[PDB]
Design an enzyme around this catalytic site. Structure first.
Site, PDB file in Angstrom:
ATOM      1  N   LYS A   1       0.800  -1.225   0.000  1.00  0.00           N
ATOM      2  CA  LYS A   1       0.000   0.000   0.000  1.00  0.00           C
ATOM      3  C   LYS A   1       0.838   1.283   0.000  1.00  0.00           C
ATOM      4  O   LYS A   1       0.700   2.120  -0.898  1.00  0.00           O
ATOM      5  CB  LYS A   1      -0.958  -0.019   1.198  1.00  0.00           C
ATOM      6  CG  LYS A   1      -2.312   0.620   0.944  1.00  0.00           C
ATOM      7  CD  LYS A   1      -3.278   0.300   2.072  1.00  0.00           C
TER       8      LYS A   1
ATOM      9  N   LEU B   1       5.376  -8.144  11.190  1.00  0.00           N
ATOM     10  CA  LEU B   1       4.295  -8.992  10.698  1.00  0.00           C
ATOM     11  C   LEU B   1       4.650 -10.475  10.670  1.00  0.00           C
ATOM     12  O   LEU B   1       5.817 -10.845  10.535  1.00  0.00           O
ATOM     13  CB  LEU B   1       3.880  -8.538   9.293  1.00  0.00           C
ATOM     14  CG  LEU B   1       3.214  -7.166   9.145  1.00  0.00           C
ATOM     15  CD1 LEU B   1       3.484  -6.581   7.765  1.00  0.00           C
ATOM     16  CD2 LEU B   1       1.719  -7.251   9.416  1.00  0.00           C
TER      17      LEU B   1
ATOM     18  N   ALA C   1       4.072 -15.166   5.860  1.00  0.00           N
ATOM     19  CA  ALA C   1       3.238 -16.146   5.163  1.00  0.00           C
ATOM     20  C   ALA C   1       4.022 -16.758   3.996  1.00  0.00           C
ATOM     21  O   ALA C   1       4.192 -16.114   2.958  1.00  0.00           O
ATOM     22  CB  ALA C   1       1.947 -15.508   4.685  1.00  0.00           C
TER      23      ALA C   1
ATOM     24  N   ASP D   1     -11.920  -4.272   3.373  1.00  0.00           N
ATOM     25  CA  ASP D   1     -10.929  -4.324   2.297  1.00  0.00           C
ATOM     26  C   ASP D   1     -10.592  -5.759   1.878  1.00  0.00           C
ATOM     27  O   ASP D   1      -9.444  -6.072   1.554  1.00  0.00           O
ATOM     28  CB  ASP D   1      -9.664  -3.557   2.711  1.00  0.00           C
ATOM     29  CG  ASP D   1      -8.829  -3.096   1.518  1.00  0.00           C
ATOM     30  OD1 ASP D   1      -9.379  -2.956   0.402  1.00  0.00           O
ATOM     31  OD2 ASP D   1      -7.616  -2.861   1.703  1.00  0.00           O
TER      32      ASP D   1
ATOM     33  N   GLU E   1      -5.335  -9.653  -2.825  1.00  0.00           N
ATOM     34  CA  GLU E   1      -4.035  -9.138  -2.379  1.00  0.00           C
ATOM     35  C   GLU E   1      -3.928  -8.943  -0.861  1.00  0.00           C
ATOM     36  O   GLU E   1      -2.830  -8.747  -0.334  1.00  0.00           O
ATOM     37  CB  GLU E   1      -3.636  -7.856  -3.131  1.00  0.00           C
ATOM     38  CG  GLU E   1      -4.764  -6.870  -3.373  1.00  0.00           C
ATOM     39  CD  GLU E   1      -5.480  -7.117  -4.689  1.00  0.00           C
ATOM     40  OE1 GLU E   1      -5.039  -6.568  -5.725  1.00  0.00           O
ATOM     41  OE2 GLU E   1      -6.490  -7.854  -4.685  1.00  0.00           O
TER      42      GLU E   1
ATOM     43  N   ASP F   1      -4.044  -6.941   6.578  1.00  0.00           N
ATOM     44  CA  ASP F   1      -4.278  -5.521   6.279  1.00  0.00           C
ATOM     45  C   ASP F   1      -5.595  -4.994   6.860  1.00  0.00           C
ATOM     46  O   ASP F   1      -6.626  -4.976   6.186  1.00  0.00           O
ATOM     47  CB  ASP F   1      -4.183  -5.254   4.766  1.00  0.00           C
ATOM     48  CG  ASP F   1      -3.906  -3.795   4.436  1.00  0.00           C
ATOM     49  OD1 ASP F   1      -3.422  -3.531   3.314  1.00  0.00           O
ATOM     50  OD2 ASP F   1      -4.163  -2.911   5.281  1.00  0.00           O
TER      51      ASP F   1
HETATM   52  N1  LIG Z   1       4.352 -13.113   2.273  1.00  0.00           N
HETATM   53  C1  LIG Z   1       3.929 -12.199   3.180  1.00  0.00           C
HETATM   54  N2  LIG Z   1       3.933 -12.507   4.495  1.00  0.00           N
HETATM   55  C2  LIG Z   1       3.515 -11.610   5.400  1.00  0.00           C
HETATM   56  N3  LIG Z   1       3.085 -10.395   5.026  1.00  0.00           N
HETATM   57  C3  LIG Z   1       3.061 -10.032   3.720  1.00  0.00           C
HETATM   58  N4  LIG Z   1       2.617  -8.795   3.364  1.00  0.00           N
HETATM   59  C4  LIG Z   1       2.174  -7.837   4.372  1.00  0.00           C
HETATM   60  C5  LIG Z   1       0.656  -7.965   4.497  1.00  0.00           C
HETATM   61  C6  LIG Z   1       0.131  -6.869   5.400  1.00  0.00           C
HETATM   62  C7  LIG Z   1      -0.442  -7.102   6.498  1.00  0.00           C
HETATM   63  N5  LIG Z   1      -0.801  -6.107   7.096  1.00  0.00           N
HETATM   64  C8  LIG Z   1      -0.505  -4.984   6.450  1.00  0.00           C
HETATM   65  N6  LIG Z   1      -0.808  -3.777   6.940  1.00  0.00           N
HETATM   66  C9  LIG Z   1      -0.664  -2.625   6.279  1.00  0.00           C
HETATM   67  O1  LIG Z   1       0.288  -2.439   5.538  1.00  0.00           O
HETATM   68  N7  LIG Z   1      -1.421  -1.612   6.713  1.00  0.00           N
HETATM   69  C10 LIG Z   1      -1.386  -0.295   6.221  1.00  0.00           C
HETATM   70  C11 LIG Z   1      -0.534   0.080   5.181  1.00  0.00           C
HETATM   71  C12 LIG Z   1      -0.522   1.388   4.709  1.00  0.00           C
HETATM   72  C13 LIG Z   1      -1.364   2.335   5.278  1.00  0.00           C
HETATM   73  C14 LIG Z   1      -2.222   1.971   6.312  1.00  0.00           C
HETATM   74  C15 LIG Z   1      -3.125   3.010   6.905  1.00  0.00           C
HETATM   75  F1  LIG Z   1      -2.403   3.826   7.651  1.00  0.00           F
HETATM   76  F2  LIG Z   1      -3.695   3.689   5.926  1.00  0.00           F
HETATM   77  F3  LIG Z   1      -4.066   2.441   7.641  1.00  0.00           F
HETATM   78  C16 LIG Z   1      -2.233   0.657   6.785  1.00  0.00           C
HETATM   79  S1  LIG Z   1       0.275  -5.256   5.007  1.00  0.00           S
HETATM   80  C17 LIG Z   1       3.492 -10.952   2.766  1.00  0.00           C
HETATM   81 BR1  LIG Z   1       3.504 -10.567   0.920  1.00  0.00          BR
END
Ligand SMILES: Nc1ncnc(NCCc2cnc(NC(=O)Nc3cccc(C(F)(F)F)c3)s2)c1Br
Length: 257
Positions: free
Chosen positions: A18, A85, A88, A131, A135, A149
């Protein structure tokens, strides 16, 4: 503990998200494998979303479910914000869908079951995701679906394409927990077909099609799947199936593992 970037060994990029990229990472003391998303302060301030990120960390500090990706906490430096985080290993469902074009009824119903369970937990702690999209769905070590997310999440009641958003949200109206249910219907369609039901080249056409609930099934979609999707994709939010009705739907029960 108050985390710093110096606590982590940075690995290869896991994806572009994002407001920044997600990297593989290892905590130096315990050798624990995780993911770090690196956001920029300027970008968060300019969008006016710093309060939303603080809400996500807060919301994720309370949520515990095997079908939900863990957010352990966050930290910042001068310019960047770092989210700690859960890793995964089998990547995004978005990547899996591009690889396979479409999923079979067995894989789809299993994902929907796992999704429903995760949402059922979220809705009981009164949290709406808002949301739900490929993705924002990841796969754990054993190929289990994990939802991620919570940046756009709110307590009921109350960036990209319009594809997964219900008529109440796109029209700037009032909405509750039933938005996740519409998005689940869109998911189920896209999993089986390979593209979302209201997909268009223009934002405006997509806006038209969602408003009217204007979509058709291709010939290979079974009646069982047709039934579930049609009962999920209804303009009147109160008429949509509940998560328990989804988990107890004949087509779900027959194909889910
Ligand atoms: N293989 C993988 N293994 C683990 N993780 C992976 N990707 C990360 C997935 C996420 C989980 N949570 C997230 N959170 C946010 O980024 N939040 C977010 C981001 C911008 C603005 C904002 C806000 F400020 F606007 F709310 C809130 S991204 C992957 Br690919």
């Amino acid at each position: 503990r108050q985390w710093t970037l110096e606590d982590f060994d940075i690995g290869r990029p896991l994806g572009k998200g994002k407001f920044g990229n997600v990297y593989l990472a290892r905590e130096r003391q315990s050798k624990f494998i995780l993911a770090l998303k690196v956001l920029f302060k300027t970008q968060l301030e300019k969008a006016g979303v710093e309060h939303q990120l603080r809400r996500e960390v807060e919301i994720q500090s309370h949520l515990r479910h095997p079908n939900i990706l863990r957010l352990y906490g966050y930290f910042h430096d001068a310019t960047r914000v770092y989210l700690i985080l859960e890793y995964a290993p089998l990547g995004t469902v978005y990547r899996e869908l591009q690889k396979l074009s479409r999923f079979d009824e067995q894989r789809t119903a299993t994902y929907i079951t796992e999704l429903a369970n995760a949402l059922s937990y979220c809705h009981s702690k009164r949290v709406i995701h808002r949301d739900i999209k490929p993705e924002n769905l990841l796969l754990g070590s054993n190929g289990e679906l994990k939802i991620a997310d919570f940046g756009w999440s709110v307590h009921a009641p109350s960036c990209g394409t319009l594809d997964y958003l219900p008529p109440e949200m796109i029209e700037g109206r009032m909405h509750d927990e039933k938005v996740d249910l519409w998005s689940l219907g869109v998911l189920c369609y896209e999993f089986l077909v390979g593209m979302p039901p209201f997909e268009a080249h223009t934002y405006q056409e997509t806006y038209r099609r969602i408003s009217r609930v204007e979509f058709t099934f291709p010939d290979f979609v079974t009646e069982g799947a047709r039934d579930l999707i049609s009962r999920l994709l209804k303009h009147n939010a109160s008429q949509r199936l509940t998560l328990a009705e989804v988990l107890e739907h004949p087509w779900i029960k027959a194909n889910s593992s």
